[PDB]
Paper text:
[name] is a saprotrophic bacterium which possesses the remarkable ability to grow in isolation using a variety of hemicellulosic polysaccharides as sole carbon sources. It produces a diverse collection of GHs, assembling enzyme systems that can degrade cellulose, xylans, mannans, and xyloglucans, among others. Effective xyloglucan-degrading GH systems (recently reviewed by Attia and Brumer) contain exo-acting glycosidases acting as debranching accessory enzymes and endo-acting enzymes (xyloglucanases) that generate short, branched β-(1,4)-glucan oligomers (xyloglucan oligosaccharides).18−23Exo-acting enzymes are expected to address each of the glycosidic linkages reported in xyloglucan branches, though the reported enzyme diversity falls short of reported branch diversity. The work presented here comprises the design and validation of trisaccharidic xyloglucan (“XyG”)-type cyclophellitol probes and their validation as bona fide, predictive tools for the identification of xyloglucanase activities and their discrimination from cellulase activities within a xyloglucan-elicited [name] degradome.
To determine the molecular basis for the reactivity of ABP-XyG-Cy5 with [name] but not CjCel5C, we crystallized both enzymes and solved their structures by molecular replacement in both unliganded and ABP-bound forms. In contrast, [name] recognizes ABP-XyG-N3 with (−83°, 133°) torsion angles. The consequent twist in the glucose backbone positions the α-(1,6)-xylose residue above W28 and W33, forming a hydrogen bond between O4 and D64. Notably, the active site cleft of [name] is significantly more open beyond the −2 subsite, so we hypothesized that cellulase-specificity in [name] is dictated primarily by an inability to accommodate α-(1,6)-xylose residues in the positive subsites. [name] showed a ∼14-fold preference for 4MU-GGGG over 4MU-XXXG, roughly in line with its sevenfold preference for ABP-Cel-N3 over ABP-XyG-N3 but highly divergent from its 3000-fold specificity toward carboxymethyl cellulose (CMC) over xyloglucan, supporting our hypothesis. Measurements of irreversible inhibition kinetics showed strong selectivity of Cel5C for ABP-Cel-N3 over ABP-XyG-N3 and only weak selectivity of [name] for ABP-Cel-N3 over ABP-XyG-N3, matching in-gel fluorescence results. Pulldowns from saturation cultures using ABP-βGlc-Bio, ABP-Cel-Bio, and ABP-XyG-Bio unambiguously identified Cel5D as the only exclusively ABP-XyG-Bio-reactive band, Cel5C as the exclusively ABP-Cel-Bio-reactive band, and Cel3A, Cel3B, and Cel3D as the ABP-βGlc-reactive bands. The secreted ABP-Cel- and ABP-XyG-reactive band in the arabinoxylan secretome (the intense band in Figure 3A, last lane) was identified as [name]. The band of interest was found exclusively in the secretome while Cel5D was found in the cell fraction, so the secretome was collected and concentrated 50-fold by ultrafiltration prior to pulldown using ABP-XyG-Bio.
Author numbering: 1 to 298
The structure:
């Protein structure tokens, strides 16, 4: 058992105090996308014991090739991680990893209903219903999808956090803050930043959203470019880390994966079952492990 998370204004609370949790996003769960081998109990317990992670995100592909809509095996991999997180007293994000979730609303509702029924009683579970909306209306496209999916979760699970994607690849948290979801408790809003691409401009939008009284949750962030490749931006990453520690913002680094790209935490061939020596981390993985392991415990 872990502390139940709630939202009060711009804070996520645990044990009656602002609290924040640091860990890794798994890569896309999709069949033959390469991330899938890391969807297992051994990776989850290694992240806890070696990285001191208190958070793992299962990034379940939806309408993209080899995703949940065409290969239900995606959900078996989510189940493995969620079960493992619960066994290790770690928070787990169930991420509907779509850029167009509002086009697959019925499928989203059915999936979150199933996840709520199975896992709703565990305080570990965090629902993320819409990874990264594109350049679409908050009020007219995202919010009504959010309302429909939240209603369905909340009929089954009245408490557990629901994180809602925001416009422009989950950047426009200031926009969401101007028309928040008020109808349901324990709703927080997605912020995504890639330190090779995003600095103070996006932090200012985040500050505006916090000032307007909504809670943020960085379910995905990178130390490299927005496209998941490029050099590690150490200085900008540290600026984001200070911002997130100051505002008690939970964070999952993209990505626990071995693909040849800057965002991968692991060198190609890093064991599917964990145990990685530090020399089998990339610059991004070494920076992500230093951030997660150093995260305030509260």
């Amino acid at each position: 058992m872990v502390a139940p998370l709630s939202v009060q204004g711009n804070k996520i609370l645990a044990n009656g105090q602002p609290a924040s949790f640091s860990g890794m996003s798994l890569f896309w769960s999709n069949t033959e996308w390469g991330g899938e081998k890391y969807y297992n109990a051994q990776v989850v317990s290694w992240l806890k014991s070696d990285w001191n992670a208190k958070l793992v995100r299962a990034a379940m592909g939806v309408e993209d090739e080899g995703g949940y809509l065409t290969d239900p095996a995606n959900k078996d991999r989510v189940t493995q991680v969620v079960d493992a997180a619960i066994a290790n007293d770690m928070y787990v994000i169930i991420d509907w990893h779509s850029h167009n979730a509002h086009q697959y609303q019925s499928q989203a509702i059915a999936f979150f209903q199933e996840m709520a029924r199975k896992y709703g009683a565990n305080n570990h579970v965090i629902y993320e219903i819409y990874n990264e909306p594109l350049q679409v209306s908050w009020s007219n496209t995202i919010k009504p999808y959010a309302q429909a999916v939240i209603a369905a979760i909340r009929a089954i699970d009245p408490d557990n956090l629901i994180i809602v994607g925001t416009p422009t690849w989950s950047q426009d948290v200031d926009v969401a803050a101007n028309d928040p979801i008020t109808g349901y408790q324990n709703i927080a809003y997605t912020l995504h930043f890639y330190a090779g691409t995003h600095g103070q401009y996006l932090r200012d939008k985040a500050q505006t959203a916090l000032n307007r009284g909504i809670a943020l949750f960085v379910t995905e962030w990178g130390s490299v470019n927005a496209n998941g490749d490029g050099a590690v931006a150490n200085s900008e990453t540290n600026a984001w880390v200070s911002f997130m520690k100051t505002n008690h913002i939970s964070n999952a680094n993209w990505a626990l994966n071995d693909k040849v790209e800057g965002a991968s935490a692991l060198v190609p061939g890093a064991s599917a079952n964990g145990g990685w020596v530090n020399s089998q981390l990339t610059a991004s993985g070494a920076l992500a492990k230093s951030i997660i392991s150093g995260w305030p415990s509260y």
